[PDB]
Amino acid sequence: LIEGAKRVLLLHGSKCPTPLHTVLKVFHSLTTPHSVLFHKKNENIHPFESTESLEFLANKNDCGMVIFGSSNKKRPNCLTIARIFDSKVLDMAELLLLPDANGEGIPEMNRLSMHVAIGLRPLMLFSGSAWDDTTSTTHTMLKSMLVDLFKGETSDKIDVEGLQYALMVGAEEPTAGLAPIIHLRWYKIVTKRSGHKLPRVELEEIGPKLDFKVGRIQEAPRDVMKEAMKQ
Amino acid sequence: RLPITVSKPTPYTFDLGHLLANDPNPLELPKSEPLNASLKATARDGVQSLLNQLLTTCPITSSQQGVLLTLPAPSTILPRHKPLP
């Protein structure tokens, strides 16, 4: 049994900071049609306390991933990513959104770009040494999660005209005493005549510019992950 | 007259079934440059490399319905949502 696209629940409460809400709207757009955006109007969940409500909402919506936006004093502008296997949380990670240098903030938007069709698979680029470090449990998890999230409905064919945009996930080179920082950036792919058969690529920045510090990590139990990884 | 090859000290690797490239070279973020510019330069090298790889190593099929690439099976193994039957 070959699973189709992993369905994604995008979740927030009423007091979710607007920039985080923008991120969820963009993520909902990027994962359309295999995603659901839900404004939970009662009160706030806390997955690292208890994953009960997160599991209940994920199962109710038949979603294998949950992206949850929340913010309080200790963990401001937090994006929590969870995966679901066999109706229970598998692994979870917190990503703490960092300020941009200029202090601009994320512009309001509902989709990645008016020049990128909703639902297209992205080209993906993981840059930085940490993704190639099999001892970094955090980068191993995050790479797995982000490919799982944005791979869409994989297929063995793709229209050349569909090769329109890219996601880069840049892992800042690790420093001994600091939580890892990762950068997500999307780009429109511009191709121009190079003189060669292959086109020259140039990029245009599109969508939200996201910088994250990694927060808490909840590993999957070894035995459960081994079960979920059976193909 | 526009270079389309990408030279880095360590080779890219690929998972073209996921339209994916890995740049294992250290992420270069010189302090004197804006973060976004630094990131964009690395992205451009990587997307160039990825597109080069897609166009040169995947069979290309043209028909009256358009032009498509055949992708190899994804090599990155990801966990299931539901158990096997």
| HEC readout, A57-83 | HHHHCCCCEEEEEECCCCCCCEEEEEE
Residues of B in contact with A211 (CB under 8 A): 35
CA Rg, chain A, in Å?
A: 18
Rounded to whole angstroms, how far apart are CA atoms A156 and B42? 27
Rounded to whole angstroms, how far apart are CA atoms A147 and A144? 6
- Of the candidates B20, B40, B82, the beta carbon closest to that of A86 is on B82
- Residue A216: which of A171, A168, A180, A165 has the closest Cα? A180
The percent helix, strand, coil of chain B (3-state, each to 5) is 30, 20, 50
String of DSSP letters for A148-163 = HHH--S--SEEEGGG-
Distance from CA of A213 to the nearest CA of B (A): 15
First to last CA, chain B: 55
Report resolution in angstroms. Answer: 1.5
Question: Residue A127 and residue B42: Cβ atoms within 8 Å?
Answer: yes
DSSP-assigned beta bridge partners for residue A204: A188
DSSP-assigned beta bridge partners for residue A9: A36, A66
Distance from CA of A66 to the nearest CA of B (A): 12
Q: What method did the depositors use to determine the structure?
A: X-ray
